[PDB]
Amino acid sequence: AKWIQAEWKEISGQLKQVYRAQHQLSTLSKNILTLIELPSIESESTVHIGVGEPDFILGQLYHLSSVQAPEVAKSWAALASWAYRWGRKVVDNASXXXXXXXXXXXXXXXXXXXXXXXXXXXXXXXXXXXXXXXXXXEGVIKVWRKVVDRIFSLYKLSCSAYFTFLKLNAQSTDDMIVMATLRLLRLLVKHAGELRQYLEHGLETTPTAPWRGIIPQLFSRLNHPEVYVRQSICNLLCRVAQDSPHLILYPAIVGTIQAMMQDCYSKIVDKLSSANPTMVLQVQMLVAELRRVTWDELWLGVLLQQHMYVLXXXXXXXXXXXXXXXXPHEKWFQDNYGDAIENALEKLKXXXXXXXXXXXXXXXXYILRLEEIAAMTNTEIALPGEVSARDTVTIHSVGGTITILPTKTKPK
Numbered sequence: 001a002k003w004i005q006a007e008w009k010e011i012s013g014q015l016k017q018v019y020r021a022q023h024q025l026s027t028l029s030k031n032i033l034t035l036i037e038l039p040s041i042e043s044e045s046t047v048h049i050g051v052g053e054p055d056f057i058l059g060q061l062y063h064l065s066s067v068q069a070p071e072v073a074k075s076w077a078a079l080a081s082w083a084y085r086w087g088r089k090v091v092d093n094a095s096x097x098x099x100x101x102x103x104x105x106x107x108x109x110x111x112x113x114x115x116x117x118x119x120x121x122x123x124x125x126x127x128x129x130x131x132x133x134x135x136x137x138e139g140v141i142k143v144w145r146k147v148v149d150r151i152f153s154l155y156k157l158s159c160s161a162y163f164t165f166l167k168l169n170a171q172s173t174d175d176m177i178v179m180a181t182l183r184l185l186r187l188l189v190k191h192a193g194e195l196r197q198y199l200e201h202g203l204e205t206t207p208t209a210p211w212r213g214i215i216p217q218l219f220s221r222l223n224h225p226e227v228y229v230r231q232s233i234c235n236l237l238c239r240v241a242q243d244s245p246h247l248i249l250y251p252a253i254v255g256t257i258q259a260m261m262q263d264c265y266s267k268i269v270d271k272l273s274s275a276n277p278t279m280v281l282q283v284q285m286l287v288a289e290l291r292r293v294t295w296d297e298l299w300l301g302v303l304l305q306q307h308m309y310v311l312x313x314x315x316x317x318x319x320x321x322x323x324x325x326x327x328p329h330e331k332w333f334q335d336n337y338g339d340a341i342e343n344a345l346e347k348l349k350x351x352x353x354x355x356x357x358x359x360x361x362x363x364x365x366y367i368l369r370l371e372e373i374a375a376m377t378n379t380e381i382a383l384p385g386e387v388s389a390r391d392t393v394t395i396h397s398v399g400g401t402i403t404i405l406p407t408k409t410k411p412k
Contacts, residue, residue, distance in 0.1 A: 001061050015054035036060050040067055046153050050090030058082060073168045080161035084183055087154030095121055098147055105139035122148050152194055155187060163202045170207040177210045189221060192229050203232050208240040212247055219251055223260045234264045238271040245272055246382035246392045253284055283381040293373050295326060295333050296360055303357040319344050328372045368402045
């Protein structure tokens with residue numbers, strides 16, 4: 001197949017001759033014809049629109065190789081790639097039994113108009129019904145549903161081949177699997193209701209080992225305007241959590257702390273906490289502490305912004321909000337700067353703000369302590385980022401002191 005693909009220009013006639021002979025020759029033509037007709041899914045009617053005659057030979061060869069050697073993954077991947085490419089091309093370019101059924105159910109211009117509207121550009125049901133009613137003036141729904149599947153059958157084969165190929169990787173390069181996972185995700189996102197039957201059972205049996213490379217994409221695609229798509233993604237993530245919880249632990253807890261992006265996160269954290277609840281609670285506490293350890297800096301920034309925008313009610317409101325939000329280290333700052341509220345209230349009815357800003361700036365000009373800003377040991381929470389780690393490593397302790405870096409906003 002690879003050699004034939006290389007010399008496509010010099011072998012385009014032989015393939016056409018083989019196809020013509022199949023529906024009614026050089027040595028290679030007859031040899032390939034005999035190879036294809038070997039007795040042990042693809043019909044000429046489906047590839048009769050948007051698919052070229054010589055390209056069908058490649059698909060037949062790939063299908064035969066896959067059925068003859070179902071234990072190899074190269075054949076499945078090649079067949080899936082070919083089917084997906086041709087399916088996408090025919091779908092993009094598309095935007096006797098049917099005629100007999102339509103005529104029998106509708107017992108010359110009317111027939112032509114109905115036939116043209118049945119496959120005009122195939123909320124779709126409502127639009128089709130309205131167009132048919134406005135043209136002719138109900139068996140049309142069945143005809144449309146039967147004709148849409150025929151022009152949408154290559155994707156089914158591509159999905160089946162991709163699922164089979166992935167099942168054998170629970171033997172191929174990672175780049176060869178990431179592409180397949182991305183294509184499957186794109187198919188499930190773009191056209192979800194057209195091939196929902198295949199994905200329904202396909203996503204309920206595939207392993208979780210090859211799906212660990214597109215986790216961020218799965219989380220980012222949790223707001224799809226559908227019903228079963230969201231549930232399927234949530235179930236897949238929950239299954240991935242098992243035997244591998246250090247992959248979706250941090251994103252789930254981070255997102256948890258529109259209701260579409262809330263129920264899924266709650267279900268994910270609930271399913272992940274059914275095994276080691278202590279680890280979940282400890283990691284949540286650690287995340288909260290980190291977020292709260294991000295006082296003096298806030299006051300200095302607020303004072304600088306207020307002074308820069310001074311040259312009213314907005315300043316008073318901002319100061320009140322900051323004081324209310326700010327109410328080991330916090331106690332010392334509050335005790336050493338407890339007159340800020342009183343000074344602001346007295347000046348409301350402005351040197352106090354300038355004095356406070358100057359004092360904060362002078363006191364700013366590094367080394368801190370973890371005890372003053374809690375301290376656990378023998379933890380079971382995974383490290384922040386373990387994409388490439390056969391055995392997860394849990395945190396044991398934290399640094400007693402934290403350093404700060406200059407020439408930046410606020411790096412610690």
